[PDB]
Amino acid sequence: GSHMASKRALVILAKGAEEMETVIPVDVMRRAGIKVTVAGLAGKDPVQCSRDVVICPDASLEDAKKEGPYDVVVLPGGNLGAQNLSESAAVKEILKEQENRKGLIAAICAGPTALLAHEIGFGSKVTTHPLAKDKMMNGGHYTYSENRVEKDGLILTSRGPGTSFEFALAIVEALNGKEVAAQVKAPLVLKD
Amino acid sequence: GSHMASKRALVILAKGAEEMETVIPVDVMRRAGIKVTVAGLAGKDPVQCSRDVVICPDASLEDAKKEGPYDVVVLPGGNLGAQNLSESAAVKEILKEQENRKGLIAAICAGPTALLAHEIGFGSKVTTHPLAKDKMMNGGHYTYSENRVEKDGLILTSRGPGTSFEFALAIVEALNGKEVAAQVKAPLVLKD
């Protein structure tokens, strides 16, 4: 088939999500030609984010899950957002399915703490926001990294709003390769 | 009165705006304690941005203008977004009023081209996205800068998505000072 596969991403958007950590990966992945579904945890209604920006999802999570599978599942941060992701049985089921089929799981800042809650990726090397490290490491189920972006097999993690572009480009590289990532980076006017 | 003045920002959101360039300044300014109104150019309905993220405004521009004045008016980029800002008589009137009262005007990437359209700040030093330089400099009404963030009196400009955090922190510094900007920067995990 075609040497230019179209890839698909699911971004799970819960109330209290960090809006920068949501929008930056969505925009950069769409620039790369990835088909991105922004799915609302609670349905299709607009989602109030951590600093009160209101984002309209593309679909409910209920409907997006039926249209899987996805090449990457993306978990933004935000304290309340990650708590809501951690309490959701629907998120549990999507992540376990993604782990079983050897799909990529990407999470940033407090987002990785939802991996702990759902028992995803134990034994992996992960990073988090510094303020979330103690939560993530309770029980010693992971190895901690201070790298701005960390990738250990199919678990890709990153630290904070200021690492969001690096995180998004790492997803693009993993899915579509280094050359597409270089294309997308070129007009962004990143520092390095 | 209080040595801790509350400041106010107006962010004008038009169809086709760059969603990263919209959300990053809104979030960072709210982290700083600035009261931010995201005003929809076309009314209060949801706005489709350049990479199809849909943002709900806080208010219509019609209503937000009545609740002025604002300490800063912020113009995001995005090609279509900046075109819509350039064609709007309501934007003209807000910017001219802001210039007359010596208020800050901040614009990023293609956003500065709306200053040219509305004859704002002629003679100032400005930057833009590299791809917008020729448009901005048609007629020689400005001096061009390649700095990532440029501030010339009350005109603050910046280059692209990757300079958005720098741009937002420059707004915070101008409004609330260096110490508040240092507070807001601390948990962002910026490279430098």
Residues 6+ apart with CB under 8 A from A81: A14, A15, A16, A17, A18, A49, A50, A110, A111
Question: Among B19, B27, B191, whose Cβ lies nearest the Cβ of A51?
Answer: B27
Cα separation, A98 vs A155, whole angstroms: 11
Residues of A in contact with B52 (CB under 8 A): 30
Cis before A46? omega within 30: no
Question: Residue A137 has what DSSP assignment?
Answer: T
Experimental approach taken: X-ray
What is the per-residue DSSP string for B108-169?
Answer: ETTTTHHHHHTT-STT-EE---GGGHHHHTTTS-SEE---SEEEETTEEEE-SGGGHHHHHH
Question: Among B52, B53, B188, whose Cβ lies nearest the Cβ of A162?
Answer: B188
First to last CA, chain A: 35
What was the resolution (in A) of this experimentally determined structure?
1.6
Query: Which residue, among A27, A58, A148, A165, would best test binding to B if mutated, counting the most B CBs under 10 Å from its CB?
Result: A27
Superfamily of domain B5-191: Class I glutamine amidotransferase (GATase) domain (3.40.50.880)
Q: Are strands B59-60 and B143-144 parallel, antiparallel or unpaired?
A: unpaired
Domain edges within chain A: 5-191
Residues A76 and A51 sit within 8 Å (Cβ to Cβ): no
- Residue in A140, A139, A30, A136 with CA at minimum distance from that of residue A74: A30
Residues B27 and B175 sit within 8 Å (Cβ to Cβ): no
For A2, the token pair is 């075609």
